[PDB]
Design a protein around this nucleic acid. Structure first.
Length: 132
RNA sequence: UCCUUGUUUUGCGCAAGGUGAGAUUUUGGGCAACAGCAGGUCUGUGAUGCUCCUCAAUGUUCUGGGCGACACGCGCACUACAA
């Protein structure tokens, strides 16, 4: 199951570029129009390569990229993509509900913070907090 | 300036009134001595002493990605919006 707009997988695939960018949100539309002229020259190819070659019963071989300014189309669904937070290629597989998004959104770029006791200088009043 | 010849010592001026566009540093600025601080700035400059680094660089990198005064229990400064 998954409904993007009340469309299963096969309808989405069937859509040509025109019919596609009509259906998607405002950002995605704006993106595609402004771009033209490739602008994901390698990031299409590398996926569709390793995608095809699979014997199924398991995911494609992972591909790595730094880029995250590229959309998620119904073409690239099922693949295993790397996305780069500035020190780690991060593992994501592409679901049918990741259509209408970007890549970068699934790849965290910071550790969430959880604190560890405040030291001196926090509290204005002075006690010279032992021991942390 | 003028007058009150008030006040003041005849002096330096002062108070009230008059004249007038304007009445007392007319109103508001800019400039500003002598002696200093071991204040700040080597992130302004082909302003720099001595040191550090130099081809797998601390250089150049307008290269790809992240981070920056932004990441979140909490204290403080200034701002804005309200009851």
């Amino acid at each position: 199951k998954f409904t993007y707009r009340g469309l299963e997988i096969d309808p989405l695939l069937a859509l040509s570029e025109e019919e596609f960018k009509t259906l998607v949100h405002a950002r995605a539309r704006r993106h595609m129009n402004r771009h033209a002229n490739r602008r994901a020259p390698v990031l299409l190819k590398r996926l569709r390569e390793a995608k095809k070659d699979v014997k199924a019963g398991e995911k494609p071989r992972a591909v790595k990229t730094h880029l995250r300014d590229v959309v998620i189309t119904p073409e690239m669904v099922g693949s295993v993509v790397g996305i780069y937070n500035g020190r780690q290629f991060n593992a994501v597989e592409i679901k049918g509900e990741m259509i209408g998004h970007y890549l970068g959104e699934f790849s965290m770029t910071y550790k969430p913070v959880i604190h560890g006791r405040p030291g001196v200088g926090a509290t204005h009043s002075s006690r010279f907090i032992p021991l942390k």
